[PDB]
């Protein structure tokens, strides 16, 4: 039986370090007319817009490349006891995954 502490040490999330400026691949699980809901393995799902080039091949289950900036968008405003989360993540599109 592997102790839980050992699992965190070798987990890919811990090996990433800071989430800012990290090249992480993700998979699309929901498609709107202009918004691509991408899951990159983090806690939440980042949202990006379809690029004007090769936009027809961004379908469900397609793998894309992301540049994570904040793992979870969250800020504190005055008069708020607890921070108001956005339940999303911030990322940008660098293209499609090169199979």
């Amino acid at each position: 039986v592997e102790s839980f502490a050992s699992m965190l040490r070798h987990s890919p999330l811990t090996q990433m370090g800071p989430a800012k400026n990290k090249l992480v691949i993700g998979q699309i699980f929901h498609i709107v007319e202009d918004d691509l809901y991408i899951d990159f393995g983090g806690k939440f799902h980042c949202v990006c817009k379809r690029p004007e080039v090769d936009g027809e091949k961004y379908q469900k289950g397609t793998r894309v490349r992301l540049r994570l900036l904040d793992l979870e968008l969250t800020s504190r405003f005055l008069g708020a006891t607890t921070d108001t989360t956005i339940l999303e993540a911030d990322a940008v599109l660098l293209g499609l995954q090169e199979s």
């Binding site: 040490r9 090996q15 990433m16 370090g17 400026n21 990290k22 992480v24 691949i25 983090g42």
Partner: protein, 135 residues
């Protein structure tokens, strides 16, 4: 009929007290399961007071000696050319490989950080990976 006070105590505490009192003559079915299997913490209502003064939280930061090595690699070479993949439980990142070879190299008895860092970079170059220095 029953008790509807949330702050008096747990659901178990009120139910067994009413039964012992003699008002609830029909024992609820979930009560027997509760006696045999109790939870870790009895559900007692408590007011979420806000922390004032010098008191802080007891949550510890998760830091490792590996993280100290990873900071130097990220500061110098930035993010590695390999793309991180979180879907693979057994994924081996370029930085993780750098740390693993750094640990093995320092087992030879080397103490200088500069020697450890440079040799690890040369050792990675022998494996074919790219380590284009930033700036």
């Amino acid at each position: 009929a029953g008790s509807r006070l949330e702050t008096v105590g747990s659901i178990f505490s009120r139910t067994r007290d009413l039964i012992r009192a003699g008002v609830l003559k029909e024992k609820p079915l979930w009560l027997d399961i509760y006696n045999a299997f109790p939870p870790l913490r009895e559900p007692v209502f408590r007011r979420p007071r806000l922390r004032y003064g010098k008191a802080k939280a007891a949550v510890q930061d998760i830091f490792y000696h590996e993280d100290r090595i990873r900071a130097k690699f990220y500061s110098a070479y930035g993010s590695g050319p390999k793309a991180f993949d979180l879907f693979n439980p057994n994924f081996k990142s370029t930085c993780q490989r750098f740390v693993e070879k750094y640990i093995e190299l320092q087992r030879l008895g080397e103490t200088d950080e500069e020697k450890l860092f440079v040799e690890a970079g040369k050792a990675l170059l022998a494996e074919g990976v790219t380590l284009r220095r930033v700036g």
